[PDB]
Design a protein around this ligand. Structure first.
Ligand SMILES: [Cl-]
Ligand SMILES: [Cl-]
Ligand SMILES: [Cl-]
Ligand SMILES: [Cl-]
Ligand SMILES: [Cl-]
Ligand SMILES: [Cl-]
Ligand SMILES: [Cl-]
Ligand SMILES: [Cl-]
Ligand SMILES: [Cl-]
Ligand SMILES: [Cl-]
Ligand SMILES: [Cl-]
Ligand SMILES: [Cl-]
Lengths: 219, 219, 219, 219, 219, 219, 219, 219
């Protein structure tokens, strides 16, 4: 288990992270964490590692691109003094290009995304014990569907950044791909983006695997 | 793992099982399974065993004792033709005796509880592939707290019926007990009965382990 | 144009047709026809052919497959004595197979779809002046996407029934296909099924062109 | 088609234009354009000219007279940098005289209307590729009904202004007159002002005809 | 004045009479009589003739034509044992012909109107002390407006039935006509049918004058 | 009729005047005047004197004592530039003494009331054509009921002030007294203060009598 | 004290007893007993006599006269098998005569009141351990106020029936009278009927003293 | 009765005191005092000592620890100029330690609690006739349940402070202990903290006993 007793773990990203969490604080008291993968991660950690006393804060906000994360980074991340920061961003950065392909101000192309996300990591890295970078995802099995294909570009950048900054790394797309061998997207998500409970569990488990979670701990 | 491809798994119980599930069907759209252990079990099964094709139904109803289960058993269990039936009942059977001590007809005492549960299990067994009996529970660490002591006794009756009938058995109380060595009830539940997400993960995991779930499949 | 002065045109289908229409009547006040292609068709007919005196009824119901159409056909089509009946069904027939793959009784497979639709068309034909069969559709440009491929097959069945019975025919999918050479589905619809205003104009126009509507009347 | 690829088309006027559009932005994302002639114009343009990538903004506000448009012109029009501006105003300017004929501060008489509307055009004309001036309307067939008669005065001014400023021009009254040969107003509108879907379609089509829209484009 | 101490006066009609009255009783608490002419009549009678002890019932129902009155006449008039019955019906009888011209079964044409009203008046007369017939009305000053012309004809039928049967008669249209020489309809009503408070005072006064009300009692 | 063509008549007082009127403006557009005696006065005036074009403003606010009227006099009266001002105040000034007889800061005793109300008149009188002073009231027939008795003291002061300032005068209590000869208060009002429709009509008619209203005008 | 361990005490009456109690059961969860004297009695009994094990049921229904009690007596009293039955009825029996004086069938006059109450008491007596008859009341200090005088008479009938049948007797009016020597009704109640918390404590105490409650138990 | 005619008694604490009282004022007008022990205390005092004219203010706010009371003391207590101040605080100070045992900023340990509460008393004592210090409570009969045990530490501090400052003193735990000999907590409260009506009555009576209340006053 990479996360240590007493420490503060802070999630940030878009509606996948937000899931109706409490604003502004995103912390603690039953329901504050929203009802998706963040809440599940904390549930399992508290079920299985109750003694760790891990504080978890949810700063997801629906709609955010990486450009929005940067605008609020100081207040929502730096000022929180986390020990661990988890980031999952990119879906909206990419989606806007496909759902509002003529309101370009709304779009965030790959080169801006990459540099902005590197900027978040590099500002944050000296301040915390660790960063976990979760790729974005599109719940779509064909690699050549245009939005899937774009999304994969952004996920490869995320991996590149995690390798280079020695951040932890979660490839959320690879986790969904495995399940898409059996299920069509409609069974897993709304509009290839908004996951069901099962989708949130896929994300939660992927995240927990990367931080060394044990389902039954090693005596 | 005990549940098999193509099988229908039906859950029944009180509000712990219910958790806002869709009525009457308890099946059939994102959200239909409610927001507690039953949804978590299904999410995990689908995350790790997508190909199993498991059909899941939530027949929990808030407020139910075993007497209420018996009155709707034909419509809500038998007529559903489940392959597996999971039962968790007893919390209200017991709690009425402590929160409305002078309304005696609302109480389901041990004798009515054993007889009626036993009966529902024996009628159901010849008609399904398997039955999982989950004990009731009370989120309280002191065995000699009157309502905990009584809840443990009711658990002992579930355990016998489960051996008497060769059903799978989940001791939900032992699962909570482990965590209560670190946490006080108020950190885990409201009013020592209604668990948090964490509480519901304890339950979901206890069930999953009993049916042979692997967090990572061996291969 | 094919529809004539004084005639009753009745539309039936699923949520695409429904769009919030008034229940049960689906006729009879500003708003009664709902907010999608059916209202747009009526608006255009009235804008360009005010004198035609066309009476229009919306019997769409959200969620319906062809099986549901058959159960209410007598009350909602026959007893209305329409002169024309427009049918667009098949999206849910197909979509249940992909979004609830393990609930098989909710699926309307090809054989049930052809038989039941064919039957409803043959019973209805002797009793009305004309019938317009609109294919179902899926807002997806890749033919080999599983659900699109299956939706195209269902369209082929509508086309035969339509030739088998000499009904007017509207290929809604070809209408969407044209636009999908420029736009990705998310720009046109939610979840590749529920169209925007634009989507509904594509449908309204496809219908209108089939019945001989002129945008400006020749004179 | 007068409107060119990439360009921004901005509608402004009163509740006929507003139709519940999103405030303040009036742009894009499904529903932002409200549910009347503006939304219909954009639907048809996107159905038929998907490749044009036209941005459309709705700045209608219920209740506005031309005096209100001027008070917000800088923020709601100039600062939007439209390429095309469509204006339809006058209904309230006239209606207040007939529904609150003793709260005169509320009224805008013809001479003030004319000069104010000329002022909007003349400020705007050097900034944009084109202006479309839509007359106001009253859904009332008798020319000598006092409010109809007043409304026509204001429409003749609008035409005069469009001729003199070389703006495009839509005579919304003439479009309604044609339909009023067959339908009494009650069938088309609420209170001779608030049009049905069909009324909004009349407006939409009138507007599209003036900008060179083709229902089926010329190959 | 025509109504007498201890008598039950029952009003029936459409939304003009209804005005939010309590259902089904239309009697029996502050507010039960609704917020229009019927409440104003009762208020005035009580202000000026408190000692008369007049019991008043409001059986108006929004949307009703004379056909609807006939279907509920037994339960809502006869069984109430009124001493006086006031009827104002015809607005919807007529308005359906203009706002839904192509839904012919919703129309109550002159022949059905005279027969059915006449019939309801003759059956009712032997059973009560008196009947007041109020003409329908339309808030429109031009006699040759089609719907006004038709409303006047319907008024003429009420007048004959009223002489044919020796009932009191209130020409609501003449009362509105007087005011329309100064005000345009929009100052008095919504959509030329639903009056303001002022409109309802015109009606209340017209009724009151017909039954011999004094504003200040002679003494 | 004391009120002249074109002039502005402004009502102020407490909830009896307020009756849910629109804030802040209290003017015009159907419903703005609330639904009690003010609305009735305007209805009758417009029914009977439509040509007068009288503007009426309602500035009643629930809860006000004369101390509250003074705090808002400049903004709600002076700045409105009325031609006629109607005041009815005192109920709360008195009621607080009986319902909260130990929160004395809330009470306004007779000497403060008198001087404050004189102060309003004297500031206002040089600015307007006329002032109408309506006494407060308590719907209670026994003169020696303590609150009735107090209320009468305040009404005698109001009369004194009207005589001395040559204001018009309406004795609302005397109007209710006449009706209380027949009806117990419960039939007329809620809690001896909040009048029914009939109570509001009593007030309306009393007011209209004082300003020279004719029910049928003198030809 | 008169009520004994293990006994069922059932309260019945009008809104004074009801006070928002749960329907139909009026028993069985925090809040089920409503928010007035009945809940206060139960709270006090439990505060001072926790060990008595008293089961309490609230069958009050707002609006009830004794005629309404009789219509539901079998289902709501007899079938509940109470040990004690407490009745407080008469306020509406009387109040209808004053607030709706001309709706005579809503009135329960003295003769119907004595007969029907007497009858309900005699049928009930053989079947229960005891009956407590609470007089109705009116919050008014003047005996010669018509409705108070009539309420006192109705109280006298309750007192006789109570001696005629050897029932416990609570003079609620004498309890209010004591306090009315200091407070005016408006300080204690709304509309002289609906008491404040204080009002309900007066009632609760009057009941408690009649059944032998000690505030501090002697010991 | 320690509280004297005319004087102002002000309650402050957490949700047990708050009980939905009106903000900010917490005073008077029916409902302003919320619906728990404060309202009950005032009800009984007004029932039994109506002539005392005691003003009671409720400044309870849900969630407060003693740290929150201090932050608002000046505005909510000092500035109110009470004659008597009642304080009951500690539940949240203690609860946070057990329900959010890793958000320590939320906790208030015994030494800070003691000094802060002494600080409130000592600032307040020279300004008022008297202070009543009510211990906090936990509705839990076992002294060694960890939260009960902690709560008792805080109650012993409160007693210590009351002794030392010559404040009046109410031991709310001792009052609940007596009742817990018979009732399990579930019958008395929600989550061992939020009392039923009976629980609020326990508190109310305990408070009244300490200030010399008589149920029947000594003649
Ligand atoms: Cl999002
Ligand atoms: Cl439950
Ligand atoms: Cl608890
Ligand atoms: Cl659908
Ligand atoms: Cl999709
Ligand atoms: Cl408008
Ligand atoms: Cl109507
Ligand atoms: Cl109109
Ligand atoms: Cl008021
Ligand atoms: Cl009642
Ligand atoms: Cl009263
Ligand atoms: Cl609290």
């Amino acid at each position: 288990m990479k996360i240590g007793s007493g420490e503060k773990l802070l999630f940030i990203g878009d509606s996948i992270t937000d899931c109706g969490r409490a604003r502004p604080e995103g912390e603690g008291s039953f329901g504050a964490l929203g009802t998706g993968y963040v809440a599940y991660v904390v549930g399992l950690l508290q079920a299985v590692y109750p003694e760790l006393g891990i504080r978890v804060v949810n700063k997801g906000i629906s709609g955010n691109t990486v450009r929005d994360l940067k605008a609020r980074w100081e207040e929502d991340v730096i000022a929180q003094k986390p020990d661990w920061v988890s980031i999952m961003i990119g879906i909206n950065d990419v989606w806007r290009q496909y759902d509002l392909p003529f309101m370009k101000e709304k779009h965030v192309y790959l080169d801006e995304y990459e540099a902005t996300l590197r900027s978040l990591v590099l500002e944050t890295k000296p301040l915390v014990k660790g960063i976990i970078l979760m790729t974005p995802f599109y719940i779509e099995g064909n690699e050549q569907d245009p939005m899937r294909r774009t999304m994969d570009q952004y996920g490869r950048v995320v991996k590149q950044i995690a390798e280079e900054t020695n951040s932890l790394f979660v490839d959320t797309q690879a986790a969904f791909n495995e399940v898409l061998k059996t299920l069509y997207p409609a069974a897993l998500a709304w509009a290839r983006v908004h996951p069901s409970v099962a989708g949130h569990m896929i994300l939660a488990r992927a995240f927990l695997r990367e931080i060394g979670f044990e389902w039954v701990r090693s005596r």
